[PDB]
Design an enzyme around this catalytic site. Structure first.
Site, PDB file in Angstrom:
ATOM      1  N   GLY A 112       0.755  -1.242  -0.022  1.00 28.65           N
ATOM      2  CA  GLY A 112      -0.085   0.151   0.031  1.00 28.65           C
ATOM      3  C   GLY A 112       0.918   1.264  -0.187  1.00 28.65           C
ATOM      4  N   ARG A 113       0.384   2.415  -0.503  1.00 28.22           N
ATOM      5  CA  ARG A 113       1.160   3.542  -0.677  1.00 28.22           C
ATOM      6  C   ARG A 113       0.029   4.884  -0.206  1.00 28.22           C
ATOM      7  N   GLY A 114       0.341   5.649   0.752  1.00 26.24           N
ATOM      8  CA  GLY A 114      -0.683   6.265   1.347  1.00 26.24           C
ATOM      9  C   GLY A 114      -0.237   7.707   2.027  1.00 26.24           C
TER      10      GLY A 114
ATOM     11  N   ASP B  93      -8.943   9.546  13.160  1.00 25.25           N
ATOM     12  CA  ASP B  93      -8.880   9.072  11.561  1.00 25.25           C
ATOM     13  C   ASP B  93      -9.425   7.784  11.673  1.00 25.25           C
ATOM     14  OD1 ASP B  93      -8.176   9.791   8.936  1.00 25.25           O
ATOM     15  OD2 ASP B  93      -6.228   8.678   9.261  1.00 25.25           O
TER      16      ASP B  93
ATOM     17  N   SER C 253       3.076   7.608   3.784  1.00 25.15           N
ATOM     18  CA  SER C 253       3.976   6.442   4.134  1.00 25.15           C
ATOM     19  C   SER C 253       3.689   5.351   2.908  1.00 25.15           C
ATOM     20  CB  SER C 253       3.674   5.566   5.249  1.00 25.15           C
ATOM     21  OG  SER C 253       2.382   5.324   5.268  1.00 25.15           O
TER      22      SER C 253
HETATM   23  C1  LIG Z   1      -0.421  -3.704  10.178  1.00 23.13           C
HETATM   24  N1  LIG Z   1      -0.647  -2.716   9.084  1.00 23.13           N
HETATM   25  C2  LIG Z   1      -0.632  -1.285   9.261  1.00 23.13           C
HETATM   26  O1  LIG Z   1      -0.013  -0.975  10.544  1.00 23.13           O
HETATM   27  N2  LIG Z   1      -0.819  -0.600   8.251  1.00 23.13           N
HETATM   28  C3  LIG Z   1      -0.521   0.653   7.859  1.00 23.13           C
HETATM   29  C4  LIG Z   1      -1.047  -1.521   7.117  1.00 23.13           C
HETATM   30  C5  LIG Z   1      -1.669  -1.454   5.867  1.00 23.13           C
HETATM   31  C6  LIG Z   1      -2.030  -2.604   5.208  1.00 23.13           C
HETATM   32  S1  LIG Z   1      -2.589  -2.377   3.490  1.00 23.13           S
HETATM   33  O2  LIG Z   1      -2.229  -0.906   2.936  1.00 23.13           O
HETATM   34  O3  LIG Z   1      -2.358  -3.801   2.885  1.00 23.13           O
HETATM   35  N3  LIG Z   1      -4.115  -2.169   3.745  1.00 23.13           N
HETATM   36  C7  LIG Z   1      -4.868  -3.453   4.283  1.00 23.13           C
HETATM   37  C8  LIG Z   1      -6.289  -3.455   3.619  1.00 23.13           C
HETATM   38  C9  LIG Z   1      -7.104  -2.314   4.108  1.00 23.13           C
HETATM   39  C10 LIG Z   1      -6.580  -1.162   3.401  1.00 23.13           C
HETATM   40  C11 LIG Z   1      -5.015  -0.993   4.151  1.00 23.13           C
HETATM   41  C12 LIG Z   1      -8.652  -2.385   3.663  1.00 23.13           C
HETATM   42  C13 LIG Z   1      -9.045  -2.102   4.908  1.00 23.13           C
HETATM   43  N4  LIG Z   1     -10.138  -2.654   5.523  1.00 23.13           N
HETATM   44  C14 LIG Z   1     -11.452  -2.298   5.114  1.00 23.13           C
HETATM   45  C15 LIG Z   1     -12.751  -2.750   5.952  1.00 23.13           C
HETATM   46  C16 LIG Z   1     -12.858  -1.982   7.084  1.00 23.13           C
HETATM   47  C17 LIG Z   1     -13.961  -2.143   8.303  1.00 23.13           C
HETATM   48  C18 LIG Z   1     -15.138  -3.186   7.701  1.00 23.13           C
HETATM   49  C19 LIG Z   1     -15.689  -3.316   8.516  1.00 23.13           C
HETATM   50  C20 LIG Z   1     -17.037  -4.431   8.624  1.00 23.13           C
HETATM   51  C21 LIG Z   1     -17.901  -4.553   9.287  1.00 23.13           C
HETATM   52  C22 LIG Z   1     -17.971  -3.683  10.407  1.00 23.13           C
HETATM   53  C23 LIG Z   1     -17.158  -2.851  10.598  1.00 23.13           C
HETATM   54  C24 LIG Z   1     -16.103  -2.462   9.520  1.00 23.13           C
HETATM   55  C25 LIG Z   1     -14.592  -3.886   6.242  1.00 23.13           C
HETATM   56 CL1  LIG Z   1     -15.944  -4.859   5.669  1.00 23.13          CL
HETATM   57  C26 LIG Z   1     -13.463  -3.557   5.645  1.00 23.13           C
HETATM   58  C27 LIG Z   1      -7.677  -2.300   5.611  1.00 23.13           C
HETATM   59  C28 LIG Z   1      -1.849  -3.871   5.762  1.00 23.13           C
HETATM   60  C29 LIG Z   1      -1.606  -4.092   6.918  1.00 23.13           C
HETATM   61  C30 LIG Z   1      -1.185  -2.892   7.778  1.00 23.13           C
END
Ligand SMILES: Cn1c(=O)n(C)c2cc(S(=O)(=O)N3CCC4(CC3)CC(NCc3ccc(-c5ccccc5)c(Cl)c3)C4)ccc21
EC number: 2.7.11.1
Length: 329
Positions: free
Chosen positions: A45-47, A155, A50
């Site tokens: 991921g890119r954000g 956030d 970071s």
């Molecule tokens: C350990 N670690 C970190 O510290 N960081 C910064 C990292 C960054 C990454 S990442 O970039 O691969 N990336 C991972 C995938 C996501 C986006 C980010 C999509 C988001 N989740 C979406 C979501 C969120 C909430 C719900 C939900 C469903 C039901 C009821 C309440 C809510 C549902 Cl249905 C879905 C998570 C990976 C590891 C990380």
């Protein structure tokens, strides 16, 4: 005579009663670990602030997540590290495992515990009413904990919630905007993503608190139960509040600004207009009905309030009937 002051109704004085070092993050000294313990495998991921990678700790073959920061002020790195360390081991809080200095960016890299993360295709499709309640409960655990520990996340949004659905595990991530709550402190309102910004940010009321996160949670619930992402779809920050007012009504908005004697940017009086408070039923259709219930609407209604002092606390939210089935189990 200016805006009327405000205090959190709960966990008001929690940081005052702690030693200065808990919240005075500018004095925190950061010790570096060995960057060579970690080999990067692939980018995740890119954000904006970071990049995030999967890595392997070659010291012990454990899989890990590395977040390499873009250049940020030392004080904000120290705040994020300090908060992560203070909250470590708390319910559903991501675990910081190490901090190293990247040889290429010469910026810090935060190293986190690995959490397996299920695709948002498998989820959001046969995500049941039960599932939403369960994972909402788990988010509330993390927020009540961090609030009780004197910290606002600022956030909260789906990007910052990770779910491992196989193991029914959830983590709240991305603590880089979190701050310590102190009574009487004025905070930066230029935080959060637009769709999740509380009315206090939008009208420039700086003396906000933990209740900011409860608005954000309300945005997420609405979006899930009505299947409308995002729920409040502003075209800019001004219009964001117009979107909110087209649902919550202008009457409670003008009452809110009167109570706290807030000065409205005159831009807003061209554009806010007059709007009725809408019944939640206007967003219910056959394609979202299975997620919507009287207790979900009652819960949502009690999160999405202009006046931050009148929103449910995390603890009160956890006590709401919406959650009776999940607490039972
Ligand atoms: C350990 N670690 C970190 O510290 N960081 C910064 C990292 C960054 C990454 S990442 O970039 O691969 N990336 C991972 C995938 C996501 C986006 C980010 C999509 C988001 N989740 C979406 C979501 C969120 C909430 C719900 C939900 C469903 C039901 C009821 C309440 C809510 C549902 Cl249905 C879905 C998570 C990976 C590891 C990380």
């Amino acid at each position: 005579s200016g805006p009327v002051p405000s205090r959190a109704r709960v966990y008001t004085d929690v940081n005052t009663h702690r030693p200065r070092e808990y919240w005075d993050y500018e004095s925190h000294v950061v010790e570096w670990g060995n960057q060579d313990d970690y080999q990067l495998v692939r980018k995740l991921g890119r954000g904006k602030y970071s990049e995030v990678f999967e890595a392997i700790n070659i010291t012990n073959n454990e899989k890990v997540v590395v977040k390499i920061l873009k250049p940020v002020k030392k004080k904000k790195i120290k705040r994020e590290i300090k908060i992560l360390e203070n909250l470590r081991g708390g319910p559903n809080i991501i675990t910081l495992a190490d901090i190293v200095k990247d040889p290429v960016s010469r910026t810090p890299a935060l190293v986190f515990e690995h959490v397996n993360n299920t695709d948002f295709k498998q989820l959001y499709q046969t995500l049941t009413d039960y599932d939403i309640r369960f994972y909402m409960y788990e988010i509330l655990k993390a927020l009540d904990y961090c609030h009780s520990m004197g910290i606002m996340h600022r956030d909260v949004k789906p990007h910052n919630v990770m779910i491992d659905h196989e193991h029914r595990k959830l983590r709240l991530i991305d603590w880089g905007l979190a701050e310590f709550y102190h009574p009487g402190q004025e905070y930066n309102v230029r935080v959060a993503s637009r769709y999740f910004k509380g009315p206090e940010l939008l009208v420039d009321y700086q003396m906000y608190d933990y209740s900011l996160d409860m608005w954000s949670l309300g945005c997420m619930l609405a979006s899930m139960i009505f299947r409308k992402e995002p729920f409040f779809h502003g075209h800019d920050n001004y219009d964001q509040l117009v979107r909110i007012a087209k649902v919550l009504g202008t009457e409670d908005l003008y009452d809110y600004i009167d109570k706290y004697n807030i000065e409205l940017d005159p831009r807003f009086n061209d554009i806010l207009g007059r709007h009725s408070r809408k019944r939640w039923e206007r967003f219910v259709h056959s394609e979202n009905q299975h997620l919507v219930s009287p207790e979900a609407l009652d819960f949502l209604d009690k999160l999405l309030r202009y006046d931050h002092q009148s929103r449910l606390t995390a603890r009160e939210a956890m006590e709401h009937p919406y959650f009776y089935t999940v607490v039972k189990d």
